[PDB]
Amino acid sequence: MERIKELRDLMSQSRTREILTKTTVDHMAIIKKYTSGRQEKNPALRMKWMMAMKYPITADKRIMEMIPERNEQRQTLWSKTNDAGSDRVMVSPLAVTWWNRNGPTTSTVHYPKVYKTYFEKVERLKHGTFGPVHFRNQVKIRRRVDINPGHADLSAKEAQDVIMEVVFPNEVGARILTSESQLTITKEKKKELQDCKIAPLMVAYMLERELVRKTRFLPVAGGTSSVYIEVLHLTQGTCWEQMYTPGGEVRNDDVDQSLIIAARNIVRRATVSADPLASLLEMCHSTQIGGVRMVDILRQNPTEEQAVDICKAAMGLRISSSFSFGGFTFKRTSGSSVKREEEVLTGNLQTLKIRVHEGYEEFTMVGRRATAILRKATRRLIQLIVSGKDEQSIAEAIIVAMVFSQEDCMIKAVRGDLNFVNRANQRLNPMHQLLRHFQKDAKVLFQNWGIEPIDNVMGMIGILPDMTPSTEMSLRGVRVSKMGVDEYSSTERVVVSIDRFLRVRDQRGNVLLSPEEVSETQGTEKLTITYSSSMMWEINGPESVLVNTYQWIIRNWENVKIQWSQDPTMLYNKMEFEPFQSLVPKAARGQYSGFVRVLFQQMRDVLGTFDTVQIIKLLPFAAAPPEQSRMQFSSLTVNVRGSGMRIVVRGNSPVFNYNKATKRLTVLGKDAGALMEDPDEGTAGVESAVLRGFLILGKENKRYGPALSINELSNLAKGEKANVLIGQGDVVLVMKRKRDSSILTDSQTATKRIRMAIN
């Protein structure tokens, strides 16, 4: 055929053969950058010149069979010529227009599917709403913002893998054939694009555009959502503004909040622990956030918070050399300081052990509602500038800055005791206590802080102690800018040191982060959170404890079922069931356990009536001393934060909802998971031919037979080994799996063994 004959021609010459045999496929793309042509400077002039010619458009040989030589007016569409470097026949724009007006027609059913991003833009515009323009001074604060809504926020590598599986089915790398998580999106796309004639490279590029995230540094003055950035030209101006709203669909996720809560819980529960470092590491390695391990999210998500930063420092990575103090992200900009320990007596006869910075340092702070700068000397506040939308933002920012300054003037201005203790009843460090105290009331300090006149100049105004604008007098080094201050432009990530106390210390010996700086606020998990760690369900509560128990049961469904079929007793005495029975009242747990145990006895006695859902629902209740009873229960009470929740043995219940149509299980509304089944004959062989779970066996082996294409591996028998071409032309011997394990659990046992040995 043409391809192999061309390869033979290439091999005939000495140099082409030498380059073929020498260069490895790894460096193929390196010899793709050795272009001997010449890039056309000023292509606009070149295009203007070219269009005047007769045949400036290059078409392919096949065009000779479909488009006739001349049209009705005898104009010349295509010419019997060839391009410089190939066999591309020469044609004129007449050929393009003739093809459009009289060419063969097909169905563009897949074009909307491949081009969902552009059509999504179309829909978002078509359903928008407008409002009156307003003319006024515009302030466009500069910041980073999303670009393309509708993305899955996948890493470039994951998007490449998805594209390779979707459009390049039998050319996927070894990682996919040695991979387990066949993403749902991949199968969705494979089903969507079954019969698509579009050029596969175009499909790949469009999927890449659709599934990737992008961020840009822009000046915005209003809404920052992704759908509010694609129309930034229409919305914001230098002197005007436009009221607009996209009318499509927003995809604001919540995994960031879940990660915040998870990290906060981990730090709060490990700070009191004996070995916070190894403990937190073990937790992070064995925790799942909405069906995905937390390690991937930590490596992927660009979150910035004290808990996550300390987690990174413990695990070992780079974090910003700054701290978010009082709800404001700080950043050093100029000068240097030295940390010195001292004891300070406040105005309430309270002695506090503090560490103050001595030096002529400068910081910039960016909060949720303000932006400020602060130049501080050795225990001396020199200059403070703030800008904020509201007066309250101004006041909180200034309070944060002054408490950070840690000057001696405010020390004598403390009124009332500073004995604030966080919700965990752990003593708060003096600076945080002072911050909260001055948040509560600072009028006395304002009266006794400092007052001096200021020269009047444009663009900046003073502030009186009652937090009102002033032009003739203000506080010492306190000023407010009438124009917004642009945030920090860059952040420095440096190597940092972490101690067992979860305190992050810089290379100069100073401390950077502490768990005490972590906010103790509690939120709600939008997405379910699963743990396989130790008795760490301290803040989980019953609501999430139920879901965690059901998740743990369903993860080990095979082992649980085998134990129930063979050794029910040991399964019943499992330790992991301890918290569930805590919720069940202590005056009835025996009756529930006995009832469920006798029900299981009847279940095993009978055959052909197997029901997985009932067993999963009723297993945790069989973990208590089974006192005999005769009453036929129908609703087993389940205490949930002082609210008796019952479980109906037959049929669905609010505390246990399983949908058969979707075969999905959820508990108290929260997501729990799904079962591994499809036909009503206890098998899982009915799938879409998932081509995963293969193990290589070294280089090609001739005995096993001629090499097979990946697409035809599906015919392989259980455990049969053959030769297949993986990657971009690498023949290897592969087999089907026989032991239902994965690569994740490897090294864990030896990991713990060597960890014990070292310590």
């Binding site: 407008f130 409002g131 009156p132 323009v133």
Partner: protein, 50 residues
């Protein structure tokens, strides 16, 4: 009367004292016909009805 422009999303109100001399393109067919009928009576922004 009250006029509104949907294109620019604007609203304005005009008094009766200026109804004697004003364009009739703003109003609809019936309203402009009524204005045409009652135009020759408005004295100092007050029609005469004997």
């Amino acid at each position: 009367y009250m006029f509104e422009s949907k294109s620019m999303k604007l609203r304005t109100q005009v008094p009766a004292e200026m109804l004697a001399n004003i364009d009739l393109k703003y109003f609809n067919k019936s309203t402009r016909e009524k204005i045409e009928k009652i135009r020759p009576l408005l004295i100092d922004g007050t029609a005469s009805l004997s």
